[PDB]
């Protein structure tokens, strides 16, 4: 099962996060959105640390490391939630103790967003996506982030390339029964980009409404570029 590059990407795995929702008070849209933003803020700390272990990431200039994260952060966040929700049915695992169903999405005003995320879930279910693939797409999405503020393009492309290769070796190694699987995997990224943008725009509108407390890191990402 061993590709070198993939094993570095599994560093943060298995992840656990909790919302620890307070049952003392009734759930509201404000409470649910606050929880999500809190989860997002904290996962970003994990995402940042995981990215440092991406061979080549830390070697880029800091502005470039920032540029990619700033373009790809939501894609990574969404991708995580997606993976955690694979063995569930029409529910999203935003935390191990915070699983959103249709009613809960409705309460948060996130039915449209969470549906799109479920579309993405559906697609990975029937492909039976793996730990290994999931972590590799995160890094690809990050590397292929399409930032317009990249200082050293050749390095970022080298990195895209290295990760692309990691994915090819892995599918060649582990999924010979389908010589295109890598291609199929790459073909899920458009939906990821689309969903990400929907999420960012929505949560940006939420920030502007000003009713939902947001922590520093989440705001920094939200207000960038």
């Amino acid at each position: 099962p061993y590709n070198k590059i993939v094993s570095h990407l599994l560093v943060a795995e298995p992840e656990k996060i909790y919302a620890m929702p307070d049952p003392t008070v009734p759930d509201s849209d404000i409470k649910a959105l606050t929880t999500l933003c809190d989860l997002a803020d904290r996962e970003l700390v994990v995402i940042i640390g995981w990215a440092k272990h991406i061979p080549g990431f830390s070697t880029l200039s800091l502005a470039d490391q920032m540029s990619l994260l700033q373009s790809a952060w939501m894609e990574i966040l969404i991708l995580g939630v997606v993976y955690r929700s694979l063995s569930f049915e029409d529910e999203l695992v935003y935390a191990d103790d915070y699983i959103m169903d249709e009613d809960q999405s409705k309460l948060a005003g996130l039915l449209d967003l969470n549906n799109a995320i479920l579309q993405l879930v559906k697609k990975y279910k029937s492909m039976k996506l793996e730990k290994e693939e999931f972590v590799t797409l995160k890094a690809i999405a990050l590397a292929n982030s399409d930032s317009m503020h990249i200082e050293d393009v050749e390095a970022v492309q080298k990195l895209q390339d290295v990760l692309h290769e990691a994915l090819q070796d892995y599918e060649a190694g582990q999924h010979m029964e389908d010589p295109r699987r890598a291609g199929k995997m790459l073909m899920t990224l458009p939906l990821l980009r689309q969903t990400s943008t929907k999420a960012v725009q929505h949560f940006y509108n939420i920030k502007l409404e000003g009713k939902v407390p947001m922590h520093k890191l989440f705001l920094e990402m939200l207000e960038a570029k």
Partner: peptide, 11 residues
């Protein structure tokens, strides 16, 4: 800058 700071961090 917290992003930066977190990126400048350690081990």
């Amino acid at each position: 800058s917290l992003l930066l700071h977190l990126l400048k961090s350690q081990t």
